[PDB]
Amino acid sequence: ATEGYPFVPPDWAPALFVPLTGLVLPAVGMAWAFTYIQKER
Amino acid sequence: NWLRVDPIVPAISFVGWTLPSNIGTSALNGQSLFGAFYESIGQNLAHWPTGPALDDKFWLYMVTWHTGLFIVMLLGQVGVQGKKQGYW
Amino acid sequence: DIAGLTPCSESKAYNKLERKELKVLDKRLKKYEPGSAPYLALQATKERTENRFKTYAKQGLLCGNDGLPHLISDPGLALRFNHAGEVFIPTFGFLYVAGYIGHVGRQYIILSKEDAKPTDKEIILDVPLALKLAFQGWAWPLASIQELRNGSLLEKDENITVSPR
Amino acid sequence: KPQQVIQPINGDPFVGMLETPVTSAPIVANYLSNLPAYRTGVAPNLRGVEIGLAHGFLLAGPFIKLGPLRDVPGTAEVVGCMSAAGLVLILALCLSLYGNAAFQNQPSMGKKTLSGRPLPQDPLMSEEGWAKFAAGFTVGGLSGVAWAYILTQILPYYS
Amino acid sequence: MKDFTTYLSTAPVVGLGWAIFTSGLLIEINRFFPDPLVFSF
Amino acid sequence: YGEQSKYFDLQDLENTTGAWDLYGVDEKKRYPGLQEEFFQRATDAVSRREALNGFVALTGVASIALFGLKGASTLELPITKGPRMEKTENGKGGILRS
Amino acid sequence: FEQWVTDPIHVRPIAHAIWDPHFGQPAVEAFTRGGASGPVNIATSGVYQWWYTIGLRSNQELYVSSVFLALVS
Amino acid sequence: KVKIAVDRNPVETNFEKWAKPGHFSRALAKGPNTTTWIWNLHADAHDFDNHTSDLEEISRKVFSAHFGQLGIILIWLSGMYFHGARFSNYEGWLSDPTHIKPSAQVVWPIVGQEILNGDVGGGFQGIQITSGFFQLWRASGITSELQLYSTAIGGLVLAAACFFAGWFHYHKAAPKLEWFQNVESMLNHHLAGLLGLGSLAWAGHQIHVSLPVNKLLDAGVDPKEIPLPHEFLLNQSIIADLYPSFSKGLAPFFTLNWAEYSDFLTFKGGLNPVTGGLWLSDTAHHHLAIAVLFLVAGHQYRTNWGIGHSIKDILESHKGPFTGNGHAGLYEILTTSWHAQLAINLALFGSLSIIVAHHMYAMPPYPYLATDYGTQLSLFTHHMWIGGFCVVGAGAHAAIFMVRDYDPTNNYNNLLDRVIRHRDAIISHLNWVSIFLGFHSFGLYIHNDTMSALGRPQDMFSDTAIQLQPVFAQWIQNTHFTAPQLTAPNALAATSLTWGGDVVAVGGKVAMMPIALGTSDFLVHHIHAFTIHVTVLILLKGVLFARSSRLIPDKANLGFRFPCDGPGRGGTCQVSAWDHVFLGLFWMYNSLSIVIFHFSWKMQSDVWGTVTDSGVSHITGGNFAQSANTINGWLRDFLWAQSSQVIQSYGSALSAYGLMFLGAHFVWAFSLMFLFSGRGYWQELIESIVWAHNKLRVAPSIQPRALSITQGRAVGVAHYLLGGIATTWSFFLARIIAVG
Ligand code: CLA
Ligand code: CLA
Ligand code: CLA
Ligand code: CLA
Ligand SMILES: CC1=C(C/C=C(\C)CCC[C@H](C)CCC[C@H](C)CCCC(C)C)C(=O)c2ccccc2C1=O
Ligand code: SF4
């Protein structure tokens, strides 16, 4: 993009990025942490 | 575990027939409390898609008659089992 | 006229506050007959208000931008200007009584400790010795100074319970 | 003849339960023993199919009826169903996580049904058995969500 | 009298006598004299 | 166990500790026989916990990415619709910024 | 930031856009402050005044600053 | 069998035990070595169980303790009557109750307090009272201050008699244990005698005294020319014109012609439109029927003449198969434990005080009480809080009985033992219903707050949006409104105007108007049910786990009020039942605070107000149906829309309420030291202060010690409760005085 070439933001960037980091990222964090704390030995 | 718990005996279903004979056709106000209940369930069946409203008198007769019934079957069960066990 | 505070005798907001208080006090006066006892109480309240406003003025008191009198706390400034009556003389006035209570409590503690089971004396007070010490505590700073020099006031820490850190 | 209805389980006053008519009723015992989660001889995936079907059929209802788009006609019945499917997927993920967590070890002590006769091991109490159970749960939940969806399309009454 | 005045000498009564004395003293000072602010004699 | 008063024997400690399945039966294949293999083949590709955790995550991240990008603005969610004309000015005590 | 540079006393700073799917239709409209189109949040951190004071004018320079600080992180 | 067993002169009357303050406890009889001796002295002062193990001396002690409390209450009542006789405007208030605010406390002009002598009208200045004593003195026919003086002097005489009675019945003639154990005689004498005789005496006083005075008062006759009640009592001619049935002269009573008494023993539903209170004829027939019901119920038990009922037989005969032994030993417990009877009596007293508050807010039984919004609000809130306190104390003393007086010998398979047996099931089910009620009440509130905040009011739980209509309460309202039509045909109108169709108003202000119930009332009522279920969970868990628990099996041997069993098992802090009561006090405080907030908001928004020609305008804008569904709506439209008069009360008659408000804020905030903190830090700080006092030789002989952990918790809960109660008291009274 013009004058915004580092880390170019599309118009659908918030509408796509917000649900992964509020939905998918906490889910992966929860599952990874739950497998961590429940790991035996 | 002695599956006779809450003993299902048809003798205590007879006491459920005395209350429609006692409350019903016993004059008092109007015709009877059970008679008024019969009239109420009669007119309530006309509006099948809907139900009784807040201003309707059906709930009063229904609740009073049903607590009277529950009281009489509870007391009949208690008496008829205290007779058998020795509790009187 | 220090720190930008006008004297209370020549302050417009002080007189406006006095007029406002007289107005609301006289507002309640119209609801009672003049020969009634609430009228006499309201009249006495108004007289006490007027006497307080008069006595607060012409006494060196000053105020600034609020109509409420201010107090000068710095010694010297309250001595060169006539403001020692605000806090300078009440300072020694309180300290005399504060040292009075501390001295009579100390003498009662010392007198009770040289007695069998002294813990009972704290919950079972004795009247003649406490009242004698109460009336023998006017010269508290004179007793405090003489005990300070000779070690009877203080105690060396070799008989004082100290923390084990 | 006192009719001591309230008694401890197996005549044992030392453990948690006491045999009570909420528990000792033949109708309640027969209904609970015939529930899929207590059919020990049946494979855990066949357990999960019925359990997920029932739970995914029930979970669609509140989402359609009280969803944010409930006032929009025609679209509430699809939004509620896909949100129910997402909830079923979340519950399947948590079920798989529980299967990983609770069956990393091996149980050594049996269940001991009344008057003895215990089977070797419940396949539900195993790792791969609970994984199959969660697989049956998510398949049943998805099929139940789709069934509640098509029941909201063809209808003689309401939704 | 001795048996009663021993009870009279305990702390709750002393908790009143000092309280009554000091309270009444301050009431009479605030009553006969008006409300002052400055100790200018 | 439970002869006249005893509740412990140390050789059938499965009965001693109180481990009892109050509701447990061992009746196998209660559903009809043709019904199992339709669902047994349904589970076998997702029976492994690795296949199931991946599939839930596969339907998870894809549908989450579908929402907002394609999921929003088709349901007319009130986040990607835009304003008409509201809230340009702010400040009731004056100053009137923006 | 450009609108703040043109008029600091009038235009308000903006921190980040608000994409909350649980927002209602009045909620989206009532948060387009600072002369924006979408729902945005008014910045009170003071970085607008600081960056206008140190000579940052265009958002290209802020983009270069962001990528440089990400590189140094 | 029942007789009067009395021991004469067991205790000498002397100040020997007054000389030594620590004499009831052998641990405190040594001396005050530490500063905790004083707190143990004032704490174990009335704990008569550890003073001695003899039940007879404990019974004598509590008998004279009740005598002393009765004398104290009689002194207080005599003082209130004297205040109404001397410093009051009761004569002015009688001639004008709708325009002159009641006042019975007169302050001194000593230091600026003359602003507190508010202009209450009638040429009188003083503190505007809120107890409603003027309404009571108008119901019970009282005209002049001479009668109030006589009542005050009689109350002082009876208080002196009660104190002398306590001294006599302890020091001079103390009853034995068998005298106190005559439970059947006690019940018969306090059913037929106390309650029945008092009800009959009050009915007679209302019929012969209060009815003519109240009949002449609402007719416009000035009280100066109203005849004194002794003229009505002696002369049948004066009482005959006001009530024609008195011309018969007790003929219909003995000839069974009670229908002729339908003029002054009426059965009317509603309130008197002239005054706003209940009809005095209705109250006369009410108290007469209550006297009848208590005279017949007071002859039930068997004491000395064969006939009657034996309570042990009644308890042991009611045995049902799911309960095993049915009420088998409870007669033995309740005849030997003072704390069990204390728990029962305190629980029933607290619940009945709650009923008293609800049924005074519902039907005002006093003339010019409904329009006096301050008296009604104060009575409701005060009896609300007293009932809550009595219930919490009932739980506390039940736990004390559990710890001390409970023994396993008499109870094997009875109801108490089986309640002990399945206590975990009860606690778990109560926790489940606790979580369920908490979620679908408070989460509903939070969801409504969120949908309001998200700009979606159509997704809220309100009347405009999807609603939770309280159909059962509205059906009960409709049934009670239509109850005089069919089920009670002899009633003139509905028993209360909560569910009526008409609005009564005295002096241009609404006395009582019909109350509409919506989604907000549903939410607040289920919030109340949740909060009460939590508090009863805490109290019942404290009672049940006081003896033993899975954590601490030997909690019985550790006493009732102990701080902890140490940091073992992860820390067993607050494990005692005393700490359970300590938490239940706060939960009570939250419950009753929300209850009285609901009462004040609902009554100010839908009942209280000033009637106009063009409809009825309430105190608020009728915003309870629109703002009580959200927490922010509750806050802004109740605690912020009101309390604007408390902050601006300065310089006015109600500035003392603002001072009390801020002092209550201080005490409520000061309590959190004793709540959050512990003892070791405070003990070390006290050690440093002790070193400071040791340096210059002012060391006290009594060692200064920090407060005990139970002592610190008690101080914290006491300061917290006092601050919260005074906060709500000041806010409620200032709002209802400056507006109502
Ligand atoms: C008369 C006895 C007496 C004396 C001489 C002292 C002296 C002292 N105390 Mg102590 N104190 C006392 C009683 C006394 N205290 C009592 C009864 C309490 C409990 C309330 C305390 C609580 C206390 C604390 C918590 C602290 C001190 C501190 C101090 C020091 C600061 C001076 C001061 O005013 O403290 C302020 C003192 C108080 C606020 C306590 C006021 C209580 C009243 C006035 C005492 C009543 C005593 C009684 C009238 C005597 C009986 C008279 C006799 C004829 C019967 C000083 C060493 C401070 C310190 O360590 O400084 C280094 C400190 O932190 N004291
Ligand atoms: C019909 C007879 C009668 C009456 C009226 C009462 C009345 C009362 N009893 Mg009871 N009592 C009775 C018989 C009676 N008793 C018998 C037979 C026994 C033995 C089994 C007891 C044993 C007993 C105990 C153990 C206790 C009471 C208590 C009380 C008081 C409870 C306080 C209350 O509720 O507020 C009502 C308050 C009032 C009405 C205030 C007026 C009080 C007047 C002066 C009492 C007059 C009633 C009296 C019986 C008259 C004869 C006494 C005579 C020697 C002077 C109340 C006054 C409690 C107590 O100690 O209080 C005294 C208590 O704990 N009672
Ligand atoms: C029918 C009424 C009644 C009776 C006869 C008793 C009798 C008893 N209770 Mg119970 N109790 C009651 C009501 C009653 N209580 C209520 C309503 C509560 C709830 C608050 C409690 C809570 C309670 C607990 C938690 C405990 C008792 C205990 C006791 C015993 C000793 C009490 C004692 O020595 O206090 C001594 C008296 C005091 C400490 C004075 C009270 C001062 C309070 C804390 C502050 C009052 C402030 C006041 C309201 C406003 C003043 C403001 C201030 C600025 C001046 C005794 C068996 C204790 C026990 O060991 O039982 C065997 C015990 O642990 N009770
Ligand atoms: C207002 C203050 C407050 C609140 C909210 C709580 C909350 C709680 N206390 Mg407590 N309590 C407090 C102060 C408070 N406490 C204080 C000061 C004391 C000291 C006296 C106590 C004493 C006390 C005792 C003695 C007991 C409790 C219990 C409870 C629980 C009751 C749960 C319930 O039924 O409600 C429902 C739940 C709530 C109200 C919590 C908020 C729920 C909101 C609406 C969120 C809804 C779901 C949400 C969307 C999920 C978020 C997901 C996110 C992670 C992504 C809960 C954990 C009791 C308990 O353990 O449960 C039986 C209990 O026995 N508390
Ligand atoms: C502050 C505090 C203390 C310290 C408090 C103590 C030692 C009590 C102090 C009581 C005082 C001495 C009562 C008297 C108060 C004033 C002296 C009264 C003044 C009256 C005027 C007229 C002078 C504890 O000991 C404690 C223990 C456990 C939990 C929390 C706490 C806690 O929070
Ligand atoms: S912090 Fe206090 S109450 Fe808790 S275990 Fe320790 S000593 Fe006991």
Rounded distance between C-alpha atoms, residue F98 and residue F85, angstroms: 14
For residue H284, what are the contacts with CB-CB under 8 A and spacing of at least 6? H203, H206, H207, H210, H211, H264, H265
- Provide the β-strand partners of residue D19: D7
- Resolution to one decimal, Å: 3.0
Structure token pair of residue H533:
């279920």
Pairing between β-strand D7-8 and β-strand H173-175 as defined by DSSP bridges: unpaired
Instruction: Name the helix (H) or strand (E) containing H461.
Output: none
Rounded distance between C-alpha atoms, residue A26 and residue H298, angstroms: 70
In 3D space, the residue among D122, D102, D101 whose CA is nearest the CA of residue D113 turns out to be D122
Residue H381 near residue H353 (C-beta atoms within 8 A)? no
Rg (CA), chain C: 26
Exposed/middle/buried for residue F91 (C-beta within 10 Å: 0-12, 13-18, 19+): exposed
Structure token pair of residue H96:
């004008």
Instruction: Name the helix (H) or strand (E) containing H105.
Output: strand H103-105
In 3D space, the residue among H643, H722, H611, H637 whose CA is nearest the CA of residue H276 turns out to be H611
Residue C159: Cβ within 10 Å count: 7
Rg (CA), chain G: 14
SS (H, E, C) D30-86: HHHHCCHHHECCCCHHHHHHHHHHHHHHHHHHHHHHCCCCCCCCCCHHHHHHHHHHH
Report residue C7: phi and psi, to 5°.
-65, 150
- Provide the β-strand partners of residue F25: D39
- Residue from the list H322, H323, H459 with its beta carbon closest to the beta carbon of D68: H459
- Provide the β-strand partners of residue H15: none
> H613 and chain E: CB distance < 8 Å anywhere?
no
Rounded distance between C-alpha atoms, residue D92 and residue F61, angstroms: 15
Residue H615: Cβ within 10 Å count: 6
In 3D space, the residue among B40, B35, B84, B43 whose CA is nearest the CA of residue B59 turns out to be B40
- Residue from the list F53, F57, F72 with its beta carbon closest to the beta carbon of A15: F72
Q: Residue F58's Cα: distance from chain center in Å?
A: 15
Residue with tokens 């550890």: H50
Residue G11: Cβ within 10 Å count: 18
Residue C73 near residue C67 (C-beta atoms within 8 A)? no
Instruction: Name the helix (H) or strand (E) containing H104.
Output: strand H103-105
Amino acid at C42: L
In 3D space, the residue among H417, H396, H395 whose CA is nearest the CA of residue H406 turns out to be H417
Closest ligand relative to H179 C-alpha: 2
Pairing between β-strand H173-175 and β-strand H125-128 as defined by DSSP bridges: unpaired
Q: Residue H610's Cα: distance from chain center in Å?
A: 30
Rounded distance between C-alpha atoms, residue H25 and residue H51, angstroms: 5
What are the angstrom distances between the C-alpha of A22 and each of B48, F61, G20, H450? 49, 11, 10, 18
For residue H36, what are the contacts with CB-CB under 8 A and spacing of at least 6? H705, H707, H708, H711
Chains with 3 or more CB pairs closer than 8 angstroms to C?
E, H
Entry field: residues in chain C: 165
Rounded distance between C-alpha atoms, residue D139 and residue D133, angstroms: 10
Amino acid at D106: Q
Rounded distance between C-alpha atoms, residue H248 and residue C106, angstroms: 83
For H18, the closest chain E residue by CA position comes to: E7
Residue F23: Cβ within 10 Å count: 16
Q: Give the technique used to solve this structure.
A: cryo-EM
H301: DSSP letter? B
- What crossing angle do the helices spanning B58-85 and B33-44 adopt, rounded to 10°? 130
Q: Which atom of ligand 6 is nearest to the CA of H564?
A: 8
Residue with tokens 């007719």: H219
Q: What's the gap in Å between H198 CA and the centre of ligand 2?
A: 12
Rounded distance between C-alpha atoms, residue H586 and residue H573, angstroms: 18
> A15 and chain G: CB distance < 8 Å anywhere?
yes
Torsion of CA H329, H335, H339, H345, to 10 degrees: 100
In 3D space, the residue among H89, H96, H95 whose CA is nearest the CA of residue H128 turns out to be H89
CA angle, residues H27, H23, H7, in degrees to nearest 5: 125
Residue H138 near residue H217 (C-beta atoms within 8 A)? yes
Residue A29's SS3 state is helix
Residue G59's SS3 state is helix
**DSSP structure string for E4-30:** HHHHHTBHHHHHHHHHHHHHHHHHHHH
Amino acid at H172: K
The sign one gets for the Cα dihedral H116, H118, H123, H124 is negative
Residue H197 near residue H274 (C-beta atoms within 8 A)? no
Q: Which residues of B53-62 are buried (b: 16+ CB within 10 A; e: fewer)?
A: eeeebbbbbe
Please list every protein residue whose CB sits less than 6 Å from any atom of ligand 3.
H 42-43, 45-47, 49, 342, 346, 389-390, 392-393, 396-397, 400, 561, 578, 581, 718, 722
Closest ligand relative to H157 C-alpha: 2
H227: DSSP letter? P
Amino acid at C138: W
Structure token pair of residue H115:
């602003």
H443: DSSP letter? I
Torsion of CA F49, F53, F56, F58, to 10 degrees: -130
Rg (CA), chain F: 31
Q: Residue H719's Cα: distance from chain center in Å?
A: 20
C137: DSSP letter? -
Residue H2's SS3 state is coil
Chain G residues with CB under 8 Å of A5 CB are 63
Rounded to the nearest angstrom, the minimum Cα separation between A9 and chain G is: 11
Instruction: Name the helix (H) or strand (E) containing G42.
Output: strand G40-42
Rounded distance between C-alpha atoms, residue H639 and residue H644, angstroms: 9
The sign one gets for the Cα dihedral H199, H204, H209, H211 is positive
Rounded distance between C-alpha atoms, residue H394 and residue H384, angstroms: 15
Torsion of CA B13, B16, B21, B22, to 10 degrees: 130
Q: Residue H564's Cα: distance from chain center in Å?
A: 32
Residue H196 near residue H28 (C-beta atoms within 8 A)? no
Rounded distance between C-alpha atoms, residue H636 and residue H620, angstroms: 13
Rounded distance between C-alpha atoms, residue B62 and residue B64, angstroms: 6
- What crossing angle do the helices spanning H709-738 and H577-606 adopt, rounded to 10°? 10
Chain F residues with CB under 8 Å of G6 CB are none
H698: DSSP letter? -
- φ/ψ region of H32 (left if φ > 0, alpha if ψ in -120 to 50, else beta) reads beta
**Sheet strands (E) in H392-545:** 504-506, 509-512
- Provide the β-strand partners of residue H512: H504
Find the distance separating the first CA and the last CA of chain F, reported in whole Å: 85
Instruction: Name the helix (H) or strand (E) containing F83.
Output: none
For residue G61, what are the contacts with CB-CB under 8 A and spacing of at least 6? none
- Residue with CA at minimum distance from ligand 6 atom 4: H573
Structure token pair of residue H119:
């202009």
Rounded distance between C-alpha atoms, residue H734 and residue H127, angstroms: 12
Rounded distance between C-alpha atoms, residue B67 and residue H610, angstroms: 44
Closest ligand relative to H441 C-alpha: 4
B54 with H486: Cβ contact below 8 A: no
Question: C44-50 — which CB contacts under 8 Å span 24+ positions?
Answer: C44/H109, C45/H109, C45/H114, C46/C22, C48/E34, C48/E35, C49/C18, C49/C21, C49/C22, C49/C25, C50/C22
Torsion of CA D5, D6, D9, D12, to 10 degrees: -110
Structure token pair of residue H461:
């739980």
Residue H424 near residue H544 (C-beta atoms within 8 A)? no
Find the distance separating the first CA and the last CA of chain G, reported in whole Å: 24
**Sheet strands (E) in H483-546:** 504-506, 509-512
| CATH number of the domain to which E2 belongs | 1.20.5.510
Residue H467 near residue H519 (C-beta atoms within 8 A)? yes
Residue H680 near residue H703 (C-beta atoms within 8 A)? no
Chains with 3 or more CB pairs closer than 8 angstroms to H?
B, C, D, E, G
Residue with tokens 């990400």: G70
Residue H8's SS3 state is strand
B86 with D1: Cβ contact below 8 A: yes
- Residue with CA at minimum distance from ligand 6 atom 3: H573
Instruction: Name the helix (H) or strand (E) containing H729.
Output: helix H709-738
Report residue C160: phi and psi, to 5°.
-120, 130
In chain B, after which residues is the C-to-N distance over 2.5 Å, breaking the chain? none
Residue F75 near residue D75 (C-beta atoms within 8 A)? yes
Residue H243's SS3 state is coil
Q: Residue E30's Cα: distance from chain center in Å?
A: 14
Structure token pair of residue G12:
């308000």
In 3D space, the residue among D118, D7, D44 whose CA is nearest the CA of residue F20 turns out to be D118
Rg (CA), chain D: 21
Entry field: residues in chain H: 740
Structure token pair of residue H359:
């049924």
In 3D space, the residue among H391, H396, H434, H707 whose CA is nearest the CA of residue H582 turns out to be H396
Amino acid at A1: A
In 3D space, the residue among H427, H248, H413 whose CA is nearest the CA of residue H322 turns out to be H413
Q: What's the gap in Å between H578 CA and the centre of ligand 6?
A: 15
**DSSP structure string for H528-587:** HHHHHHHHHHHHHHHHHTTT--SS-TT-STT-SS--BS-SGGG--BT-SHHHHHHHHHHH
Torsion of CA G55, G59, G64, G65, to 10 degrees: 50
Rounded distance between C-alpha atoms, residue D120 and residue F41, angstroms: 26
Residue-number span of the structural domain to which E29 is assigned: 1-41
Structure token pair of residue B14:
């007879």
D157: DSSP letter? S
- Provide the β-strand partners of residue C63: C6, C69
CB-hemisphere CA count at 13 Å for D58? 5
Chains with 3 or more CB pairs closer than 8 angstroms to A?
D, F, G
In 3D space, the residue among H149, H218, H195 whose CA is nearest the CA of residue H507 turns out to be H218
Rounded distance between C-alpha atoms, residue B48 and residue H223, angstroms: 64
Q: What's the gap in Å between H699 CA and the centre of ligand 1?
A: 10
Q: What's the gap in Å between H406 CA and the centre of ligand 3?
A: 21
- What crossing angle do the helices spanning H709-738 and H655-676 adopt, rounded to 10°? 160
Instruction: Name the helix (H) or strand (E) containing H24.
Output: none
How many domains does one find in chain E?
Answer: 1
Rounded distance between C-alpha atoms, residue G34 and residue G41, angstroms: 9
Rounded distance between C-alpha atoms, residue C120 and residue C117, angstroms: 6
Instruction: Name the helix (H) or strand (E) containing H528.
Output: helix H519-544
H529 Cβ below 6 A of ligand 4: no
For residue H30, what are the contacts with CB-CB under 8 A and spacing of at least 6? H22
Residue H78 near residue H159 (C-beta atoms within 8 A)? yes
Rounded to the nearest angstrom, the minimum Cα separation between H110 and chain E is: 6
Entry field: residues in chain F: 98
